[PDB]
Design a protein around this ligand. Structure first.
Ligand code: MG
Ligand code: MG
Ligand code: MG
Ligand code: MG
Ligand code: MG
Ligand code: MG
Length: 109
RNA sequence: AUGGCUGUCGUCAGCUCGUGUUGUGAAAUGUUGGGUUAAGUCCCGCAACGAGCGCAACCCUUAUCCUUUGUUGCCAGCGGU
């Protein structure tokens, strides 16, 4: 059921109290996420993703420059998948009508 | 009361607008930060992405060379001198 068991992690500060229910603690000299309360979560996330996937929904994966970089690179690239690897321009989805002028620039260029 | 025209800050590099976002609001952001430049000139970063007026560049003159033309300008090679 579990996808590997390697979640050693490194974060040791700034635990958000709002997400207490999903945390175990003890190990890490700080904290750790509960592995039992995550098997029944992503197994749903995918269930919901499938619906939009049907009408070839635009997922638009996100990872900012060095956040993933070597972790994602371009594995997102597929038949009907898109991604943002470089800096996520501050406020581009909300003013997409303003980013059309720049996407046209990229196309013409 | 004005049109038109002109002086000065000042040939200093600044002054603004679209959408976006933040704030109850006047407003802020961008336009600030790290470098650099004669310059809001350019690069990186960034809650902003673009654009406009301005700076530079297009203009004239000057400093080198080449093509054409050779008088009313010029005289290197030759001659009457
Ligand atoms: Mg508001
Ligand atoms: Mg200013
Ligand atoms: Mg301002
Ligand atoms: Mg600066
Ligand atoms: Mg400029
Ligand atoms: Mg002679």
């Amino acid at each position: 059921m579990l996808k590997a068991g390697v979640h050693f992690g490194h974060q040791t500060r700034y635990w958000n109290p709002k997400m207490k229910p999903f945390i175990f603690g003890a190990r890490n000299k700080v904290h750790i996420i509960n592995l039992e309360k995550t098997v029944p979560m992503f197994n749903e996330a995918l269930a919901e993703l499938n619906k939009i996937a049907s009408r070839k929904g635009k997922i638009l994966f996100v990872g900012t420059k060095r956040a993933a970089s070597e972790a994602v690179k371009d594995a997102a690239l597929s038949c009907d998948q898109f991604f943002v690897n470089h800096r996520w321009l501050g406020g581009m989805l909300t003013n997409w009508k303003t980013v059309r002028q720049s996407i046209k620039r990229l196309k013409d260029l």
